[PDB]
């Protein structure tokens, strides 16, 4: 059996697109960061660098009620996770971190899964700020480094390509998924 | 470092006492199950056995807004988890399962931890319906058996005594903690 931990923001749910659209809607006069100029995992810090007052503004978008509930799916993501879940000798968990400002994030993530993937996938959510203490064979995640209390996680991190990580070049000893069309089944097969 | 997974309901937060209190307040005419007569992990099924329509009435208590937020702490629990978190070479996570009816459970659990233990402990929450895929040395949990996709969890389950499990007689292979005034430090030491 192969256990796949599938990240939520940037892999199933399009956080970055949601952030930019909410920022453009609520702060139309201010400078913004086009998606393909994004660099680094923390959008708030790139906005701060653009202009100091933008840090709190962009935070207000992703901390607002409804923000997580209303995110659009990543193309191909929901079909892929459905397909993956239905493979023999495969199990899937959705392994996601809440924001530090958790209040409108935790419940909305559960509802987003319920609505987009259904009740069977709600039961496969793991909410944690430390993914390294979750046992699995693979972690598909857009964060460029996934760190925590286990120095040597059980899983292999598969970087899922996203605007903020596109610029990185992995060494030949590592693998990137370019998108959900980039033959994920072969990565799972390497663990069988 | 020894990593201790600490359950929430029945170990930190007194679910059973809150359930009974809420049931007696909402349904003051109805028969109830005194805590000392509780048997089996799921109160709802004991109520169903008492009279079939009581099952849904008890569920309406623990599904109501505020139910989780308003639980009282288990005696000694908050002090013990504070002391444990500060021990040298010791890691604590709060590892808790949401209800299937998650809506008024997930956010309320985060707020309960924030209020009773503080923001830093909120970062130590792991929400999962499968605790067997969480890495640790020890799981302190009142559920009589803790099962999931790993047939042999990394952790040793320490059964935390609660009204519903007290009469359970276990083989000497399974260890029990009678309360937070029992010798939990020795159990941690047995893994160092
Ligand atoms: Mg992500
Ligand atoms: Mg419990
Ligand atoms: Na399957």
Pick out its properties.
homodimer; 192 residues; alpha/beta; Rossmann fold; 2 domains; 7 helices; globular; binds magnesium ion; binds sodium ion
Calculate Rg of chain A over CA atoms. Answer: 17 Å
For the largest interface, the chains and their residue counts are: A-B, 29 and 29 residues
N-C termini distance of chain A: 7 Å
Hetero groups in this structure are: magnesium ion, sodium ion
CATH names the topology of the largest domain in chain A as: Rossmann fold
Set out the fold topology.
The structure is a homodimer of 192-residue chains.
Chain A: E1 2-6, H1 15-26, H2 43-50, H3 54-62, H4 77-85, E2 90-96, H5 106-117, H6 119-122, E3 125-128, E4 138-141, E5 156-160, E6 176-177, H7 184-189
Parallel strand pairs in A: 1-2, 1-4, 2-3, 4-5, 5-6
The structure holds magnesium ion (2 copies) and sodium ion (NA).
One magnesium ion is lined by residues 7, 9-11, 141-143 of chain A.
Describe the structure concisely.
The PDB classes it as hydrolase. With 192 residues, chain A is of the alpha/beta class.
What do you see in this structure?
Two copies of one chain form a homodimer. With 192 residues, the first copy, chain A, is of the alpha/beta class. Chain A has two domains: 1-14 and 70-192, Rossmann fold; 15-69, Deoxyribonucleotidase, domain 2 (Ribonucleotide Reductase Protein R1, domain 1, Orthogonal Bundle), CATH 1.10.40. Chain A has helices at residues 15-26, 43-50, 54-62, 77-85, 106-117, 119-122, 184-189; strands at residues 2-6, 90-96, 125-128, 138-141, 156-160, 176-177. The first copy, chain A, has a six-stranded parallel β-sheet with strand order 3-2-1-4-5-6, covered by helices on one side. In chain A, α1 crosses α3 (54-62). Chain A is globular, with a radius of gyration of 17 Å. The termini of chain A are close together. At the A-B interface, α5 and β3 of A face α5 and β3 of B. β3 of chain A pairs antiparallel with β3 (125-128) of chain B. The structure holds magnesium ion (2 copies) and sodium ion. One magnesium ion binds next to loops of chain A.
């Amino acid at each position: 059996s192969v256990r796949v931990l599938v990240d939520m923001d940037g892999v199933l749910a399009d956080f970055e697109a949601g952030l930019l659209r909410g920022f453009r809607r609520r702060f139309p006069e201010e400078p913004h960061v086009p998606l393909e100029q994004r660099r680094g995992f923390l959008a708030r810090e790139q906005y701060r660098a653009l202009r100091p007052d933008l840090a709190d503004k962009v935070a207000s978008v992703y901390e607002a009620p409804g923000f997580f509930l209303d995110l659009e799916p990543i193309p191909g993501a929901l079909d892929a996770v459905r397909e993956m879940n239905d493979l023999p000798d495969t199990q899937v968990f959705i392994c996601t971190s809440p924001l530090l400002k958790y209040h409108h994030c935790v419940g909305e993530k559960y509802r987003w899964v319920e609505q987009h993937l259904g009740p069977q996938f709600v039961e496969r959510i793991i909410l944690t700020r430390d993914k390294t203490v979750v046992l699995g064979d693979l972690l598909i995640d857009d964060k460029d480094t996934v760190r925590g209390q286990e120095e040597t996680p059980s899983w292999e991190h598969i970087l899922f390509t996203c605007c903020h990580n596109r610029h990185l070049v992995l060494p030949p000893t590592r693998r990137r998924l370019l998108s959900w069309s980039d033959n994920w089944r072969e990565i799972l097969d390497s663990k069988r």
